[PDB]
Design an enzyme around this catalytic site. Sequence first.
Site, mmCIF file in Angstrom:
data_model
loop_
_atom_site.group_PDB
_atom_site.id
_atom_site.type_symbol
_atom_site.label_atom_id
_atom_site.label_comp_id
_atom_site.label_asym_id
_atom_site.label_seq_id
_atom_site.Cartn_x
_atom_site.Cartn_y
_atom_site.Cartn_z
ATOM 1 C CD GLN D 11 -2.811 1.397 0.320
ATOM 2 O OE1 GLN D 11 -2.678 2.320 -0.475
ATOM 3 N NE2 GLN D 11 -3.823 0.540 0.259
ATOM 4 C CD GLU D 245 31.685 8.693 -5.201
ATOM 5 O OE1 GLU D 245 31.852 8.869 -3.977
ATOM 6 O OE2 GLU D 245 32.603 8.832 -6.037
HETATM 7 N N1 GTP Z 1 3.936 7.855 3.971
HETATM 8 C C1 GTP Z 1 2.916 7.058 3.670
HETATM 9 N N2 GTP Z 1 2.702 5.912 4.400
HETATM 10 C C2 GTP Z 1 1.665 5.099 4.101
HETATM 11 C C3 GTP Z 1 0.812 5.408 3.055
HETATM 12 N N3 GTP Z 1 -0.119 4.437 2.977
HETATM 13 C C4 GTP Z 1 0.126 3.524 3.939
HETATM 14 N N4 GTP Z 1 1.219 3.928 4.652
HETATM 15 C C5 GTP Z 1 1.835 3.201 5.776
HETATM 16 O O1 GTP Z 1 1.372 1.868 5.764
HETATM 17 C C6 GTP Z 1 1.085 1.415 7.066
HETATM 18 C C7 GTP Z 1 -0.087 0.445 7.038
HETATM 19 O O2 GTP Z 1 0.281 -0.774 6.431
HETATM 20 P P1 GTP Z 1 0.134 -0.961 4.841
HETATM 21 O O3 GTP Z 1 1.343 -0.443 4.105
HETATM 22 O O4 GTP Z 1 -1.127 -0.255 4.416
HETATM 23 O O5 GTP Z 1 -0.031 -2.543 4.610
HETATM 24 P P2 GTP Z 1 -0.157 -3.131 3.121
HETATM 25 O O6 GTP Z 1 0.897 -2.550 2.211
HETATM 26 O O7 GTP Z 1 -1.547 -2.884 2.596
HETATM 27 O O8 GTP Z 1 0.070 -4.709 3.287
HETATM 28 P P3 GTP Z 1 -1.210 -5.645 3.532
HETATM 29 O O9 GTP Z 1 -2.045 -5.080 4.654
HETATM 30 O O10 GTP Z 1 -0.762 -7.043 3.879
HETATM 31 O O11 GTP Z 1 -2.014 -5.674 2.256
HETATM 32 C C8 GTP Z 1 0.767 2.662 7.863
HETATM 33 O O12 GTP Z 1 1.303 2.561 9.159
HETATM 34 C C9 GTP Z 1 1.430 3.794 7.112
HETATM 35 O O13 GTP Z 1 2.577 4.206 7.812
HETATM 36 C C10 GTP Z 1 1.021 6.558 2.317
HETATM 37 O O14 GTP Z 1 0.268 6.841 1.389
HETATM 38 N N5 GTP Z 1 2.077 7.383 2.629
HETATM 39 MG MG MG Z 2 -3.134 -3.614 1.435
#
Ligand code: GTP
Ligand code: MG
Lengths: 48, 431, 22, 432, 186, 48
Positions: D11, D245
Site C-alpha cells: 500500500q 558513492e
Molecule cells: N507515507 C505514507 N505511508 C503510508 C501510506 N499508505 C500507507 N502507509 C503506511 O502503511 C502502514 C499500514 O500498512 P500498509 O502499508 O497499508 O499494509 P499493506 O501494504 O496494505 O500490506 P497488507 O495489509 O498485507 O495488504 C501505515 O502505518 C502507514 O505508515 C502513504 O500513502 N504514505
Molecule cells: Mg493492502
Amino acid sequence: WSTQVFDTIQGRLQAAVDARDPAAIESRLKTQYDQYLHTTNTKVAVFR
Amino acid sequence: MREIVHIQGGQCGNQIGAKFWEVVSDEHGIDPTGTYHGDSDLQLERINVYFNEATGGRYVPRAILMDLEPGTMDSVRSGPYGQIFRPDNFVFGQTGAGNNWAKGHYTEGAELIDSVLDVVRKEAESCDCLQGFQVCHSLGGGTGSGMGTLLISKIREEYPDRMMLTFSVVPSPKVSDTVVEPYNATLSVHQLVENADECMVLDNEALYDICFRTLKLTTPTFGDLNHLISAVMSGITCCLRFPGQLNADLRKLAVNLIPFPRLHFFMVGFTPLTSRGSQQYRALTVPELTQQMWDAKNMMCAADPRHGRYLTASALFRGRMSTKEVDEQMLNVQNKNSSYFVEWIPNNVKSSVCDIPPKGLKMSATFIGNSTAIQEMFKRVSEQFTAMFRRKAFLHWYTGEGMDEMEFTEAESNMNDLVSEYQQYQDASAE
Amino acid sequence: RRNRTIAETMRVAADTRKLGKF
Amino acid sequence: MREVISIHIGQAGIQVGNACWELYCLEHGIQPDGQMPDAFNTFFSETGAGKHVPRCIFLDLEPTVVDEVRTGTYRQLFHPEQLISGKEDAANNFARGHYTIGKEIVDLALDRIRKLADNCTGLQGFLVFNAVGGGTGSGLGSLLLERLSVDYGKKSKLGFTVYPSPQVSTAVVEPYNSVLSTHSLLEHTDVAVMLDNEAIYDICRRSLDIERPTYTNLNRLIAQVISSLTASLRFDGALNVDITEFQTNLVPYPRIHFMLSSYAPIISAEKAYHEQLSVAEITNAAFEPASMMVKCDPRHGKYMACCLMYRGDVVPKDVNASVATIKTKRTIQFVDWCPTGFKCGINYQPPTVVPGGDLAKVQRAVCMISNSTAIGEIFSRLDHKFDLMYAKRAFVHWYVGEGMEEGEFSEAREDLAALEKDFEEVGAESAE
Amino acid sequence: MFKNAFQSGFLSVLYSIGSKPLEIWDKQVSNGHIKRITDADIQSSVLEIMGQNVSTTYITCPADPNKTLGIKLPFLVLIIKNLNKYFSFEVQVLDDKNVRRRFRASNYQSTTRVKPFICTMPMRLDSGWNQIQFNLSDFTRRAYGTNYIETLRVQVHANCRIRRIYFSDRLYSEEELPAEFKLFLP
Amino acid sequence: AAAAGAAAVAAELPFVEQVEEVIAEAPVRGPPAPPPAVAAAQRASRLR
Ligand SMILES: Nc1nc2c(ncn2[C@@H]2O[C@H](COP(=O)(O)OP(=O)(O)OP(=O)(O)O)[C@@H](O)[C@H]2O)c(=O)[nH]1
Ligand SMILES: [Mg+2]
Ligand SMILES: Nc1nc2c(ncn2[C@@H]2O[C@H](COP(=O)(O)OP(=O)(O)O)[C@@H](O)[C@H]2O)c(=O)[nH]1
C-alpha cells in the site's frame, strides 16, 4: 601493529560491551526516547 | 475481485438482511427491478463483491435465504426490494422449527441442510476468489440459531481457509422475547466459538436506547432498528467495495482485532447519528464522530464498555478526510482514558479510511470493539441457564429430538470457559 | 490424589472440566 | 548508461509510487501520457516510440490500490504487464506475505524483473519502497529481497521503508511485522532509510502550516527526498554522488546501514518571500530535529557519516562554510573515529514543484541523509512494544498457522538485540 | 488378513512394549501427537494418543482401508489409562446377515443411540488405569437380533494411554491370565 | 554424582521420560517456550 594496537583496543571495547548487559541499554534508550516524546508532546516544537 | 457470500437464517436474519440489501442496492445504484442506475463509476467498479450479473444487465444479490417457516419469506419476497433475490436461493421448509434448537440443528433442520449447502456450494464455486461467508441470524430463536449454526459448522469443514462474519442478535437483558432464550443462546455460542472466525454482537435493547436517546424516535419501528444494523454491516465491508488511502479488508480486521483464537466476539456501533432537531447544529468533523464513536450509548451491545478494558478496537472511517485527524484523534482517545484500554497491547486502535462516504452523509465511521466487558452478557445468559437447567424445565423439548443432555453441559462449560478468559485477560498485567 | 500461555493453560485442562460438569 | 530499477511493494510503496513518478515525470518534462513534447517526426511519434516507460514494478496482493494506477491519470505511462496485482492481500501478516500467498506472486514478480534487467544496458542498483508495518510490505518485501540477493550480485539494494511511529499507528500487529521485516533488511538490504509518518506530519503541520494533512501531502515530500538522492545520476553538477558513492561513504560497517533523512527548505508559498534561504541557514535548518523525517532526537546519539546533497545554484564555497558551522556546534556531535564526516553533492537543477503541491519554488535545497547511532533509539521503542505483545504470545496463531514457526519470532528478535548492541559498540569513543 | 493365523485362547493384536510397537497399526494425526511414554505408576512404556479434536486423530488396525481384519473371538480387552479426558473407540463387526455394524463408544455422551448401521455407546471409567472388556457377541445380540461372526475394524480415536489390547474367547481374571498379559504382576 | 542423582530420584517421584519414538506430531510444535529469566540469560549469553 595488530597485536600492540588493534587487538588491545578491541579487547577493551568488547570487554566493556560484554560488561554492558543489553536490558540496561533498552531501558536507558526507552527512558530517553520517552523523555523526547513527552517534551515534543507537551511543548510547542523542539529546537536544537 | 474479493467477494462475500451472504447467508440469512431465521426470522431475524431474513428481516435484518432484507433491510441490509436495501442499503447495498442503494449504495451501488441497483434499482428495485435490479438494473443498474448509479450515477458514479466507482459504484460499478466493485459490484461482484455482492452481486452476480444476470441477463439484461441487472444484478441479483449473492444471498441464500433459509427458514423452516414459509411466513418469513413471503414478507421478504413480496416486500420492497424483494424481487432482486433469486427464487432458487429461497431454500426453505414447511414444518417449522419453532424456537427449538434441537429441531433446527438435529432433526427438522437437517433435511434442509443438504439443500441449503447445495446452493451455497453453487454460489461459492461459481465465483472466483472468495473472502468468507457473511451470516445474519439470531441466538434467542431456534430456527435461525439452530439451522444457521449447522451451516456454519458444515461450511467450515468444506472451506477452512475462509472467514465467518456472523451478525447474531442476543437475548435482551431487560426482556425475553422467547421463553427458551437461555437454552438457545448458550447452545449456539458454543457452536460459534470453534466455528465462526469473528462474531459481531447485537441486541434489541441497545438499539432501542440509540433510537430514543440520540435519534429521538419515540416510536422506533421494526425496520428502524434494522436500518441501524444494516449501516454497520455495510461499514464493515467498506474498504472492499470502494478505494481509500488505507484499505482494510475482512482479514485485516480479524488479524488485528483477535489476539487469541477464542476472543472473537465484538461490539459494534455507527458513529454519525443525530436527530433532525439537531442536524443543522452538528459540525460533522473527525473530532465530532470520534466523540460519538467511543461513547457507551452509541454501542449496539448491552454490555457497558466502561466496565472492562478494550483488548482491541477498530474503526472503519469513510469520507474525504485527512489521515492525521484520524491519526491524532484515536491517539488522543487512548491517552485521555488509558484505564479503559488494555495495557499489554500497545496501539489498540486499528484505523482505516475509505474515500467514498455513504449516500447522504459527508462523513461516517463504523466501530468494532473487542472489549472484555462483553463477558457481562455471557455471564447473564449463563445465569439464566443454571436457573432453568437445574429444574430440567423446557428441557424435554430439546432431548425429545435425540439430543443428549451432555451437549447442555458441553455448551455452558465452553461458555464458562469463554467468560473465564475474558476476566483473566482484563486482570493480567505486563511487568 | 495430588512457560505456557494462559490460553493454552485453559485449553489443555478445559476438557477435564467438560467431563466434570456432567 | 547508468540506471536504477525501482520496486514498489504494498500500500505505502505505490502510493509513494504515484507521488514519486509524478515528480520524476515533471523533472524531465515527461508528459502523463508518456511522450515528451518532417517525415521522421511522424515516424518517431506513431510507428516508433518516443515514449519513455518507467523502470519500476508496482506489485501488491490487494488489487484496489493497483487498479487505481491502472485507472488513474498515469494509466498510459506504465506497461499493463508492469503492474502486478493479486487475489487476496497479505492482510497485516508477515506469514502470508513470506510463506503462503507471497510465494505465488514472487515467482511472477521476478519474471518482470528479468525483463527490466534485460532492457537496461548497465544496471547500478535497486530501489525498494515498502512499509514494514503491513503484511505485503514486510512479507513480500522480505521474500523479494531474499530472492534478489540470489540471482543478482554486485548490484546494490536501496531501501526506503516507512517504519512505524512510536505514538500513533494505523494497525495493532504493527510491532510484529516490523521486527520480522527488520531481520531481512539487516541481512539482504545494502542501504535502508528510516521513514516515520509522525515526523512527516510535524513537518507538514509546523513548517508548511497545513493543519489537516493526508497521505497525499506526506508522499509529495517523501518523493522529494527520493528524487533528490538519485538526482546526481540524472543531472550533471559540480560534484556528483553516484549510487555507489552513497554506499562507500555512509556505511562504515556492513551491519550498520540505517540512515535518517531531512529536507531543508520546507517553506510554504506565503512564507517563502519573507524567508531568506541561503546555504548557511538551510543547512542549519537541515539538522533541525523538527525538519527530520524520522521522529527521533539526533542529539541523543552521534552522527557517523552524513551526506549533504544540494540542488539549484549552490557554489562549493558556501557548502564548505555550512560544514564548518555545523562541526563547531556543541549540540551536533560527531563520533571520534570519523574526522572527515561529510560528503557534499551539488546538482545544478533547482527542485521542481508539483503543480498544486504545497511546497513553494526555492532555488536551494538540502537532502541530508546521515548515518547516526540514534537509529537504535527508534528500534528500542519498537522492541519494547514487541516484548510486551510477545510475552502474552498474542497475535501468534495468525503467524504460526500461515507457515511460520514459533522460532522465527525469537530469531528476528535476537538479531535486533544485536543491532542494539552494535550501535552501542560502534558509537563508543576513545578518549585520552 | 488374520483368518489363517488363528491362535487358541488369547490373540494379542497390539502390544506397546517391543522393538516396534506400531507394527501393523496405521497412524493418523491432526493437531495431536502419538508418543511412546513410560508412565509414572507402572513405570512401563505405553503408547499415548493425544489430540485437541477427537474425530481428527486416530489409529486403525487394518492399514489399508480396503483390507479387513478377522478374529472369531467374542471379547476385546483393552488396557487404557483414564486421562480425565475424552476417550473414544470403535469396533466394526460382520454379523450373521453379512452386514457391517459399527459399535462406537465414547466419553462425551450419556445416552446410547442405535441407528440401523451404527450404534453409539457411553463409556464411564474409574480413576487410574483400567481394562475394558467389550463383549462383542453380547453387545451385538443386545443391539440387533443377529450374532457375531468376525471383527473387521478396531480403532481408537481419543486422548489416552494404550498398552495390551487383545482378543479373548471368555472372561479371564488375574489368576488364570497368561504370563505377560498382567500389567499388574501380583 | 550417581549417589546425588539417586538421592534426588528417591524424592522426585517417577518422572514421565521423553519418548524414544516420538512417532507423530501433526502441529510440529518442536521446542517449547523457555521461561522468562532463563530465556533472558540465554539471550544475554548468545549476544555476549
Ligand atoms: N507515507 C505514507 N505511508 C503510508 C501510506 N499508505 C500507507 N502507509 C503506511 O502503511 C502502514 C499500514 O500498512 P500498509 O502499508 O497499508 O499494509 P499493506 O501494504 O496494505 O500490506 P497488507 O495489509 O498485507 O495488504 C501505515 O502505518 C502507514 O505508515 C502513504 O500513502 N504514505
Ligand atoms: Mg493492502
Ligand atoms: N433487531 C432485530 N431483531 C429481531 C428482528 N426479528 C427478530 N429479532 C429478534 O429475534 C428474536 C426472535 O427470533 P425468532 O423470530 O424466533 O428467530 P427464529 O427462531 O429463527 O424464527 C427476538 O429476540 C427478536 O428480538 C429484526 O428484524 N431486528
